[PDB]
Design a protein around this ligand. Sequence first.
Ligand code: MG
Ligand code: ZN
Ligand code: ZN
Ligand code: ZN
Ligand code: ZN
Lengths: 143, 151
Amino acid sequence: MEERIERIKKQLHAASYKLTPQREATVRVLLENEEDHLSAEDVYLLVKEKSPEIGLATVYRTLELLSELKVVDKINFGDGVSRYDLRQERFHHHLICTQCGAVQEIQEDLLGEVERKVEHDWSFKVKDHRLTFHGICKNCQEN
Amino acid sequence: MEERIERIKKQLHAASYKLTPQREATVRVLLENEEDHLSAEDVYLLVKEKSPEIGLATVYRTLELLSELKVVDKINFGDGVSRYDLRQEGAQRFHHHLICTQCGAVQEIQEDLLGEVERKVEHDWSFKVKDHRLTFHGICKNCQENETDEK
Ligand SMILES: [Mg+2]
Ligand SMILES: [Zn+2]
Ligand SMILES: [Zn+2]
Ligand SMILES: [Zn+2]
Ligand SMILES: [Zn+2]
């Protein structure tokens, strides 16, 4: 058992960096969309646009492996879906449509006035800030 | 077929006022600790302190259903742990947080400081905002004055 512990160990560790081309495909779809903030639905459907023998559960397990091993980050921005964004590694803003899933980054920094107010009001030294907005987007208001 | 669906409807209604006791157990733990932001694991522990004939799956499934219903909100903090944040009742926008990147204090902000800004994004990007999630990161008030006793 004591060495069976070991056998299993090296099984698991192998399973973590040894990448099947099934896993490798989920990674391809991540690298091919860095700015984009992809859901499990998303990464799935795009893996099928090259290798559709894949299986959704495979795609999920792979993502869930990456996020453990701090290569991607699960995030919930509050649209009620966990999104897997890579960490190639003020942070920008997001508008996330709670229907058509349309993301839009805001390049500007609209906080300013708020950032300062906080500081005064709480005696807090701001360094970084991450804002996400929820609302069915321009195009869905017309379709 | 539509008969079978109605049957299924009656099925679930039973299961539900069958299952509410373990629902109430979990909703307690949340309410008792609104200042904390509990991970599912956390809840689980606190619920066997009263109702340990519970099992973990029924707690999670409750937690998820409750964030389905906006009653609570799932939140990572950079610590790679999904945590269930209770929304103050009747609120229209989720609270803000100040996180400390050191000591790790978390301050819910009950006011809504993004009003003028909501109005700007709604304008500039022809968007219809229905909620938001704002978080700041920064060494907090007391960590300014306890690393002025450590240099
Ligand atoms: Mg700023
Ligand atoms: Zn973004
Ligand atoms: Zn949209
Ligand atoms: Zn909170
Ligand atoms: Zn602090």
